């Protein structure tokens, strides 16, 4: 517990403070000055040692360099301590006595692995190389893996739980790195933890496996040869996804501990997107599956654009084929456990998993996933509701009620018409709907008796013993609730059950009509009166559905081959190009139950109930119910107004959840007249809105939601006094014009103004353009998100093109420079403003117009030079006949340099957030997409010529980002953002930069499973290079280089469209075909797999006729004799065709192809 | 009423002391009391519990402690109780519950070493489930086919596999819906192996089997490597090149389940050493 | 080739039997073949299925031949016996268990203790992993499950590991750890009856002895005394009664009495040989019906008593009492009709009362040197006093009475003397007059046992009427097995 030397100081300059902090509490509590000398627990208790080890791990998380430092800065006496000691010696506490210290050491190793990989950008070869030169530490990152492995097999359950947590942190990082085989090994090791008596270990394992991306794992399994054998020479396959899904995630749904069951169900939902199955339409092999996920975010191109219940979806849905297959496979597995369920736990767990799955992936949306529209499995779930033991479990009973309602509601579109239940028109489902509807009325009747504590006709249950048992269970739970005060307890079994019963009944009420309910409508209103006090929200929601059914407003009464090239480049580019192209173009019964909602609104503080009473009130007005009959003395409308005083001064606990409904209710109430007296006028509602924005409340949650029901009323459906209010609202919208939500409001206003007064549409568009564009220059627009920028992009299209035709204002705002680039938020706002304007220039104007106006407004290429960039990054705010294309191309190339530099050299948590990291890559993706379109469409020839020349040229005295500088920043993004690297690869081709320094490296050209991201680039780059050669057949070097160095990858990737054309081009050329045959002969051994050999023959089939004598030689020498008879037959057929087309040609030509000795 | 609860706590106490034959007898007694009370769900639950207790008796007498003196005596009582429960369920509807009970009985029989009766009960459960839960019926038929392969009823297994393929194609569609795609893949591989084993003549060669054999002389939903290996296997068995089937059997071992590995081994064995010769 | 030879050497003439001078070489070859399969599995890949079967077929058959078993059991071949345990365990794991998974999911050289642990691991695996059709057997091809089951049972009976294997694992974790001592250093003493007073460890012991049978008369007496010590809470008594019944019944297996891996229970069918055969024309039928029968067996008969894959090896456990087993070709239509083809488990009509009256010389033992008369007499006296509470026997539990009566019915197959049958009938008849008749779980065993007793007694007039009143009475019973047993008594 004594510092026997110098560790440095906290206020030191040569090294970060965390380096000293790790040194300070490692020498103080964990290490002496000697090698492998644990501090005895007498001096410092194991409680401190465990607490100190967690401090090191948390510190090492933010700074992995601190872990490798020498314990003492100044080497102490070399006689008493012959060998200096490193901080990395604290890992010897993996063999301590108490379990807590052992577990903390395991977590430290797990944290250390995750940080080192996340800090090296998976380049640990270089990061550990420099750290071992700077500090001299010989520690290897592959040493914590054995520590984690043996800590999982620990006697103590406490240590094993902490060891699992350590794996959870570092398992995904290990898989996505050069140590993938170790990451795969950890997944294998943790699988045995399902057989643990400690529930915490079981729940921890479920959460650990929920983090696994099985598309990545399937890639690792596919190329793992020795790891399939395991330690005992196994002869099969690992099948990790099958084991994890079935033997762990589904299996633990049958656990006797409800907490373990709940975690398994949650982990099941998370795994569904990340599963991978072979022979899928969306993705063929795991590499494409991985590339889909990464390209779906960075390359997410950005654009913009009587209430059915929760579980209904009428309009067709563009559902992903891939995870519909994943959803169906999982749902099948859960249901197979439900039929073959011998235990109550498995039945309870599986029913809960399906209920949660129907919420995460709605059955109405994913009907093809829920076993085809569909009803999925409703007879099974309704069978359990008719059982004698399943209903008695309130937790599982309500899980079945919600699931059963979802499945029946999922068939609504295809199972309606326009007896009993006339609207269904699919009489197979009538018994199912009738059973559930009767069952729901019974359980609600039971709850009605329980609240009314009266001892026990459609909902009658007094003669059914199975429901009498349920009533006893519900009576007990309420009796327990009646003598406790735990108002903030959400998981109250009785309250949750009544809510679920009223929830599903409200859902089923959609499919019903007046005919089959008017008889039983009075008994349900009786049930809700007793159930209102306990559950006022859902009791009011059920009232709304009854009105929607009684008035015929519900749904029933109102009815009438993709590979890397496609996903990485072609599909996003085509959408981007297309978007650019389009740019240029019985009621009296409800009154007792409705006054209670009004009476409770003025007394409750539950905004969820309060915003529902207004929703009910809005619906009542929409049904032309006389409002004066409800508000006999204007009390409620007076009370609602009085709520604004507390709302605008911040004295309302949650006003953001009630403001949208208050204003929507008020604007609807302005039409109603109290016998030639208006209840409230639009001018007062406008004045109420302006008070909200005038106060200090955030406009994003109080003023913007207030405006939406007003602009969607005045400007969508509504002239002496109307016009001036519209301008006042427009003026108020102008104040909040910096918020992207208001931009959506202006998009709606402009579109409607485009049809009433086109001249006014011109003026408003000019007014908006002259306002936002200056603020885009000064970064005053809140466009620092993908959603925000997309709204701004579409707003420009809606604007009158006359407002943007003089591009002087656009170029003035685009060619600007931010206040500083030391702040990530400012950099994003600056670039986001540029990309919004850049899209306009290349879509609403021509190259000639843009380049012409650049001359008059003398923008310099040095607007953002390397000097200006570096000066700005420190917060310091303070020629020749240069063609405009140079200035325009230099501006975009410098922006690429800025984004590349601070995507690969900016900390993921210290200097920038996680959303900020994604938007950084999204900004780069849309910028590289813009560059590709500019260099590929051919509509910008001078810019392409300038950029092609500027890429070739060096930096002007180091004042500009040279190409080598950009490549270095891009070459290091291969392991992290392969999607963006492929876009950069595409640009390098569009500027004819085809030097093999960059290309032979990304393709891993031949002069430990590896990273998946490295493979996405390696395959993606090869595809793009072949596409480039397909446009440059005259170039005879990039064609011969590809064949002699990448023929195996050409054959493997032959199913890709660009590769298909390249092989076809090779076939047309006689010289290319000769090289194609020769390369295959030199690499025939790798072309031995039946899958790869078949692809070899498919390529080798339509080869050039002049090479027939050469390919025939290869057939009967190295391909005819295979164990696989189908391929030998294929070789025989192709070999026969070559001979039959050789004797059917000119004799001397055939003589040349086959010499006599060869024949 | 009260007698039923008395018999229930009697059975609970008897199961507490693990004299579970008498616990099952008390469950039968409470089922009779429910009959007197005309309570179908409660009687079905009581019969299910009695059958489960009898099945546990037989499992202990045959699996936990393998008693040669056991002659499947509580298995008869379990089957009788389960049949009564299934009959009650069907008479009150709920064919899914009866199919579940039949699946339970079939699983018990399969574990106890009676694949034929297990396959029969699995087929009965699938027939009970088919009009309403086609995927559950397909799973039950798959269990039936596995049991029939256990009982060496290769032609019955082929018929069940063909029926499952037809049902999956006509219910899970054109491309399958994933949950039916794996069923179709299993059907295809198992049917191909069984047709190479049995080698039906043109008289027995149904149009479906002929079409499937034509497909292997492109890949619907099988992985390309597995499809190519199956095509090579079909060509080798049509060519009688025993070395080819040996090499394939080595190659397709990791890509097949244990059931399909057994089927491929049977194909190879009947290739080298045909059965029926008497030597 | 060797497997085809060994599978038929049991029914060959004397001069074609296994030469004693080539027994050692065969054992060495069998071990070498299994070593080669493991070596090929380790280095290249899994061997051919026809090669795995050939290697394991030799091991399965060699351990079944008494000439070869006595060679591998000798101390000289302890390394070879250990190699078989290693290779079989290696192959089973390399085929059934995936990486990161356990086979059982919840002084002397080191390999000796490891081999003991391997067999004890595999023996417990016969419950789930190697139980054909079990959910845990889905990873094992069906052509290896019967082959590996027979090998393990044969290996677990080796003197090297038999003593260790019979000890339940629940005892090892307890304080019991005596010093082993023997020719191999692993002859652990039989566990004390104090442990067996716990149910969950008694179940493990019963499974161990039933699976492995017994290796000698000394072992039979040891486990006979051990079960007697336990048999003096009621859960322990019924478990002991069942265990004793299985142990006594285990003496009826015909080829080798103790071995469960070579033998099956005696069958004495109630049907006499058919007269229509062995005529001028019936002889031709036998030749042609034999070919049809020889294929029905290979296609529909559950090969319970056959381990290897060879098809034409069916044989029934019907000794020529008057001895060696009657060849299957001479039992064309004699086997009991109610018995499944190839099924050899115990059934309620296991031995006909003809065979009770024949060989035993009765008007209307000591198999393999194990005195069963001393045993069978002991339980008969013991059970009779147990179920007859002449004094205040505190109302003997119903579960005990039912399980005891079932024991009487099963062990009645081994009753040798007429007085034994007379006592059991009188014992059961008294039990009827005192036990309430509403019981059905009891009547399912009582009815056939009483009928079987009266059957041997000659169905005399005095013994006729009570049995006749009983059979009709239990015919109209709600309990199905009571009806089934009643018919068997009929």
Curated annotation (Swiss-Prot), chain B:
<dbReference type="GO" id="GO:0016604">
    <property type="term" value="C:nuclear body"/>
</dbReference>
<dbReference type="GO" id="GO:0005769">
    <property type="term" value="C:early endosome"/>
</dbReference>
<comment type="function">
    <text>RAB5A effector molecule that is involved in vesicular trafficking of early endosomes. Mediates the recruitment of HTT by RAB5A onto early endosomes. The HTT-F8A1/F8A2/F8A3-RAB5A complex stimulates early endosomal interaction with actin filaments and inhibits interaction with microtubules, leading to the reduction of endosome motility.</text>
</comment>
<keyword id="KW-0007">Acetylation</keyword>
<keyword id="KW-0963">Cytoplasm</keyword>
<comment type="subunit">
    <text>Interacts with HTT (via C-terminus). Interacts with RAB5A. Found in a complex with F8A1/F8A2/F8A3, HTT and RAB5A; mediates the recruitment of HTT by RAB5A onto early endosomes.</text>
</comment>
<dbReference type="InterPro" id="IPR011990">
    <property type="entry name" value="TPR-like_helical_dom_sf"/>
</dbReference>
<keyword id="KW-0967">Endosome</keyword>
<dbReference type="GO" id="GO:0005634">
    <property type="term" value="C:nucleus"/>
</dbReference>
<protein>
    <recommendedName>
        <fullName>40-kDa huntingtin-associated protein</fullName>
    </recommendedName>
</protein>
<dbReference type="InterPro" id="IPR039494">
    <property type="entry name" value="F8A"/>
</dbReference>
<dbReference type="GO" id="GO:0099518">
    <property type="term" value="P:vesicle cytoskeletal trafficking"/>
</dbReference>
<keyword id="KW-0539">Nucleus</keyword>
<dbReference type="GO" id="GO:1901799">
    <property type="term" value="P:negative regulation of proteasomal protein catabolic process"/>
</dbReference>
Swiss-Prot record, chain C:
<protein>
    <recommendedName>
        <fullName>Huntingtin</fullName>
    </recommendedName>
</protein>
<feature type="short sequence motif" description="Nuclear export signal">
    <location>
        <begin position="151"/>
        <end position="160"/>
    </location>
</feature>
<comment type="subunit">
    <text>Interacts with PFN1. Interacts through its N-terminus with PRPF40A. Interacts with PQBP1. Interacts with SETD2. Interacts with SH3GLB1. Interacts with SYVN. Interacts with TPR; the interaction is inhibited by forms of Huntingtin with expanded polyglutamine stretch. Interacts with ZDHHC13 (via ANK repeats). Interacts with ZDHHC17 (via ANK repeats). Interacts with F8A1/F8A2/F8A3. Found in a complex with F8A1/F8A2/F8A3, HTT and RAB5A; mediates the recruitment of HTT by RAB5A.</text>
</comment>
<comment type="similarity">
    <text>Belongs to the huntingtin family.</text>
</comment>
């Amino acid at each position: 517990c004594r510092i026997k030397g110098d560790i440095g100081q906290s206020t030191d300059d040569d090294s970060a403070p965390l380096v000293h902090c790790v040194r300070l509490l490692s020498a103080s509590f964990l290490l002496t000055g000697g090698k492998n000398v644990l501090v005895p627990d007498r001096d410092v208790r194991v409680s401190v040692k465990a607490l100190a080890l967690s401090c090191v791990g948390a510190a090492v998380a933010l700074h992995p360099e601190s872990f490798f430092s020498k314990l003492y800065k100044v080497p102490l006496d070399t006689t008493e301590y012959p060998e200096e000691q490193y901080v990395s010696d604290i890992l010897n506490y993996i063999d301590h006595g108490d379990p807590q210290v052992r577990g903390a050491t395991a977590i430290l190793c797990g944290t250390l692995i995750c940080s080192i990989l996340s800090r090296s950008r998976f380049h640990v070869g270089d990061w550990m190389g420099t750290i071992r030169t700077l500090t001299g530490n010989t520690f290897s990152l592959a040493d914590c893996i054995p520590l984690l492995r043996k800590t999982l097999k620990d006697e103590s359950s406490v240590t094993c739980k902490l060891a699992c947590t350590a794996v959870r942190n570092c398992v995904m990082s290990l898989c996505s790195s050069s140590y993938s085989e170790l990451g795969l090994q950890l997944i294998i090791d943790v699988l045995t933890l399902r057989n643990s008596s400690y529930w915490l270990v079981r729940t921890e394992l479920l959460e650990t496996l929920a983090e696994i991306d099985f598309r990545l794992v399937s890639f690792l399994e596919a190329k793992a040869e020795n790891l399939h054998r395991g330690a005992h020479h196994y002869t099969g396959l690992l099948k990790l996804q099958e084991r994890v899904l079935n033997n762990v995630v589904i299996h633990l749904l049958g656990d006797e501990d409800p907490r373990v069951r709940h975690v398994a169900a949650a982990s099941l939902i998370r795994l569904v997107p990340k599963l991978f199955y072979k022979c899928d339409q969306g993705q063929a092999d795991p590499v494409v599956a991985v590339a889909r996920d990464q390209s779906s975010v960075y390359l997410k191109l950005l654009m913009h654009e009587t209430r059915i219940y929760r579980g209904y979806n009428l309009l067709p849905s563009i559902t992903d084929v891939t995870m519909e297959n994943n959803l169906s496979r999982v749902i099948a597995a859960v249901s197979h456990e439900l039929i073959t369920s011998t235990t109550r736990a498995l039945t309870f767990g599986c029913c809960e998993a399906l209920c949660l799955l129907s919420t995460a992936f709605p059955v109405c949306i994913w009907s093809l996933g829920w076993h085809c529209c569909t009803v999925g499995m409703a007879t099974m779930i309704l069978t359990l509701l008719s059982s004698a033991w399943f209903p008695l479990d309130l937790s599982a009973h309500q899980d079945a009620l919600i699931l059963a309602g979802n499945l029946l509601a999922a068939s609504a579109p295809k199972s309606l018409r326009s007896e009993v239940w006339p609207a269904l028109g699919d009489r197979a489902l009538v018994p199912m709907v009738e059973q559930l509807f009767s069952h729901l009325l019974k359980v609600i009747n039971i709850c009605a008796h329980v609240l009314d504590d009266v001892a026990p006709s459609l909902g009658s249950f007094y003669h059914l013993p199975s429901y009498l048992k349920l009533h006893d269970v519900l009576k007990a739970t309420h009796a327990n609730y009646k003598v406790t005060l735990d108002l903030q307890n959400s998981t109250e079994k009785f309250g949750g059950f009544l809510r679920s019963a009223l929830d599903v009944l409200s859902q089923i009420l959609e499919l019903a009509t007046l005919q089959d309910i008017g008889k039983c409508v009075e008994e349900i209103l009786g049930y809700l009166k007793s159930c209102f006090s306990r559950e006022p929200m859902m009791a009011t929601v059920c009232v709304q559905q009854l009105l929607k059914t009684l008035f015929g407003t519900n749904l029933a009464s109102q009815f009438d081959r993709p590979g890397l090239y496609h996903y990485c480049f072609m599909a996003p580019y085509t959408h981007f190009t297309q978007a650019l192209a389009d740019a240029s173009l019985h009621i009296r019964l409800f009154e007792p139950l409705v006054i209670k909602a009004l009476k409770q609104y003025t007394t409750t503080t539950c905004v969820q109930l309060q915003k529902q009473v207004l929703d009910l009130l809005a619906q009542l007005v929409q049904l032309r119910v006389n409002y004066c009959l409800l508000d006999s003395d204007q009390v409620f409308i007076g009370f609602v107004l009085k709520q604004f005083e507390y709302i605008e001064v911040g004295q309302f606990r949650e006003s953001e959840a009630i403001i949208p409904n208050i204003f929507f209710f008020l604007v609807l109430l302005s039409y109603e007249r109290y016998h030639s007296k208006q209840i409230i006028g639009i001018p007062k509602i406008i004045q109420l809105c302006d008070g909200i924005m005038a106060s200090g409340r955030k406009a994003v949650t109080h003023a913007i939601p207030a405006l939406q029901p007003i602009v969607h009323d005045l400007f969508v459906l509504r002239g002496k006094e109307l016009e001036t209010q519209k301008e006042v609202v427009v003026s108020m919208l102008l104040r909040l014009i910096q918020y992207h939500q208001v931009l959506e409001m202006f998009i709606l206003v402009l579109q409607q103004c485009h049809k009433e007064n086109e001249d006014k549409w011109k003026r408003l568009s000019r007014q908006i353009a002259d306002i936002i564009l200056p603020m885009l220059a000064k970064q005053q627009m809140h466009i620092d998100s993908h959603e925000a920028l997309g709204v701004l992009n579409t707003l420009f299209e809606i604007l009158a093109p006359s407002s943007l035709r003089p591009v002087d204002m656009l170029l003035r705002s685009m060619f600007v420079t931010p206040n500083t680039m030391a702040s990530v938020s400012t950099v994003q706002l600056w670039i986001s403003g540029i990309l919004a304007i850049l899209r306009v220039l290349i879509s609403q104007s021509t190259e000639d117009i843009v380049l012409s106006r650049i001359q008059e407004l003398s923008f310099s290429p040095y607007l953002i030079s390397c000097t200006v960039i570096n000066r700005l990054r420190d917060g310091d705010s303070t020629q020749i006949k240069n063609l405009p294309e140079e200035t325009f191309s230099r501006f975009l190339l410098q922006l690429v340099g800025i984004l590349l530099e601070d995507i690969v050299t900016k900390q993921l948590k210290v200097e920038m957030s996680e959303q900020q990291h994604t938007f950084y890559c999204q900004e780069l993706g849309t910028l590289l997409m813009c560059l590709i379109h500019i260099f590929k469409s051919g509509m910008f020839r001078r810019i392409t010529a300038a950029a092609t020349r500027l890429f070739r040229s060096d930096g002007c005295g180091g004042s500009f980002y040279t190409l080598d500088s950009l490549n270095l920043r891009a070459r290091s993004m291969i392991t992290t953002h392969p999607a963006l690297v492929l876009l950069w690869c595409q640009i390098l081709l569009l500027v004819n930069h085809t030097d093999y320094r960059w290309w032979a490296e990304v393709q891993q050209t031949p002069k430990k499973l590896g990273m998946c991201n490295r493979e996405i680039v390696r395959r993606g780059a090869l595809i793009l290079f072949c596409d480039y050669v397909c446009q440059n057949l005259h170039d005879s070097e990039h064609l011969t280089w590809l064949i002699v160095n990448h023929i195996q990858d050409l054959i493997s990737l032959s199913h890709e469209p660009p590769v298909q054309d390249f092989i076809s081009a090779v076939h047309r050329n006689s010289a290319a075909s000769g090289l194609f045959i020769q390369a295959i002969q030199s690499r025939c051994e790798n072309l031995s797999t039946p899958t790869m050999l078949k692809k070899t023959l498919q390529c080798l089939e339509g080869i050039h006729l002049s090479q027939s004598g050469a390919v025939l030689t290869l057939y009967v020498d190295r391909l005819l004799c295979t164990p696989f008879r189908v391929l030998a037959r294929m070789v025989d057929i192709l070999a026969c065709r070559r001979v039959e087309m050789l004797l059917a040609a000119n004799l001397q030509s055939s003589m040349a192809q086959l010499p006599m000795e060869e024949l | 009423a009260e007698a039923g609860e008395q018999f229930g706590q009697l059975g609970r106490e008897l199961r507490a002391q693990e004299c579970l034959p008498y616990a099952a007898w008390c469950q039968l007694a409470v089922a009779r009391c429910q009959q007197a009370l005309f309570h179908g769900p409660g009687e079905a639950l009581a019969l299910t519990e009695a059958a489960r207790l009898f099945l546990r008796q037989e499992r202990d007498a045959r699996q936990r402690l393998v008693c040669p003196a056991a002659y499947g005596e509580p298995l008869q009582a379990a089957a009788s109780a389960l049949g009564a429960a299934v009959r009650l369920h069907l008479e009150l509807g709920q064919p899914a519950a009866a199919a579940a009970l039949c699946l339970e009985l079939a699983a018990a029989l399969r574990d106890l070493g009676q694949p034929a009766a297990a396959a029969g009960h699995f087929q009965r459960a699938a027939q009970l489930q088919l009009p309403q839960l086609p995927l559950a019926a397909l799973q039950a038929l798959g269990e039936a086919a596995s049991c029939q392969l256990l009982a060496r009823d290769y032609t019955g297994a082929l018929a069940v596999f063909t029926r499952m393929q037809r049902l999956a194609r006509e219910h899970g569609s054109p491309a399958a819906l994933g949950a039916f795609s794996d069923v179709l893949v299993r059907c295809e591989v198992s049917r191909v192996l069984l047709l190479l084993l049995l080698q039906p003549p043109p008289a027995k060669l149904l149009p479906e089997h002929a079409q499937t054999l034509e497909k292997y002389s492109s890949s619907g939903q099988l992985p390309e490597e597995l499809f190519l290996l199956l095509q090579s296997l079909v060509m080798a068995t049509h060519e009688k090149d025993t070395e080819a089937i040996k090499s394939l059997q080595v190659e397709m071992w990791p890509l097949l389940t244990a059931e399909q590995n057994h089927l491929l081994h049977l194909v190879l064995q009947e290739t080298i050493s045909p059965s029926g010769q008497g030597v | 080739a060797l497997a085809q030879y060994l599978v038929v050497v049991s029914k060959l003439p004397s001069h074609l039997h296994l030469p004693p001078e080539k027994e050692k070489d065969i054992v060495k070859f069998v071990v070498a073949t299994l070593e080669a399969l493991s070596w090929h599995l380790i280095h290249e890949q899994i061997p051919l299925s026809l090669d795995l079967q050939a290697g394991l077929d030799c091991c399965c058959l060699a351990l079944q031949l008494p000439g070869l078993w006595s060679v591998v059991s000798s101390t000289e071949f302890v390394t070879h016996a250990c190699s078989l345990i290693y290779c079989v365990h290696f192959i089973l794991e390399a085929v059934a268990v995936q990486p990161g998974e356990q086979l059982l999911s919840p002084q002397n050289p080191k390999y000796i203790t490891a081999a003991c642990e391997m067999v004890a691991e595999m023996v417990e695996s016969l419950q789930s992993v190697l139980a054909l059709g079990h959910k845990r057997n889905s990873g094992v091809p069906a052509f290896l499950t019967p082959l590996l089951r027979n090998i393990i049972i044969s290996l677990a009976r080796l003197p090297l590991v038999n003593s260790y294997t019979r000890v339940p694992p629940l005892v090892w974790k307890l304080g019991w750890s005596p010093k082993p001592g023997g020719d191999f250093g692993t002859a652990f003493p039989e566990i004390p009856v104090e442990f067996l007073q716990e149910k969950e460890v008694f179940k493990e012991f019963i499974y161990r002895i039933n699976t492995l049978g017994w290796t000698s008369r000394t072992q039979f007496e040891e486990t006979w005394a051990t079960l007697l010590g336990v048999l003096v809470r009621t859960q322990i008594n019924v478990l002991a009664v069942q265990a004793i019944t299985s142990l006594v019944l285990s003496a009826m297996t015909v080829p080798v009495a103790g071995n469960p891996a070579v033998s099956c229970l005696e069958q004495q069918p109630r049907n006499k040989p058919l007269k229509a055969l062995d005529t001028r024309f019936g002889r031709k039928l036998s030749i042609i019906r034999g070919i049809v029968e020889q294929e029905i067996q290979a296609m529909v008969s559950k090969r319970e008593n056959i381990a290897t894959h060879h098809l034409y090896q069916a044989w029934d456990p019907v000794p020529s009492l008057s001895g060696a087993l009657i060849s299957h070709e001479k039992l064309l239509l004699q086997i009991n009709p109610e018995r499944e083809l190839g099924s050899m488990s115990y059934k309620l009509g296991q031995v006909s009362i003809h065979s009770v009256w024949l060989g035993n010389s009765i008007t209307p033992k000591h198999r393999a040197g194990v005195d069963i008369h001393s045993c069978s007499q002991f339980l008969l006296e013991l059970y009779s006093r147990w179920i007859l509470p002449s004094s205040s026997a505190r109302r003997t539990p119903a579960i005990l009475i039912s399980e005891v009566v079932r024991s009487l019915l099963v062990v009645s197959d081994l009753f040798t003397e007429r007085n034994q049958f007379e006592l059991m009938y009188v014992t059961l008849t008294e039990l009827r007059r005192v036990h309430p008749s509403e019981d059905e779980i009891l009547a399912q065993y009582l009815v056939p046992a009483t009928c079987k007793a009266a059957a041997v007694l000659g169905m005399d007039k005095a013994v006729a009427e009570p049995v006749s009143r009983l059979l009709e009475s239990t015919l109209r019973s709600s309990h199905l097995p009571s009806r089934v047993g009643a018919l068997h008594g009929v």
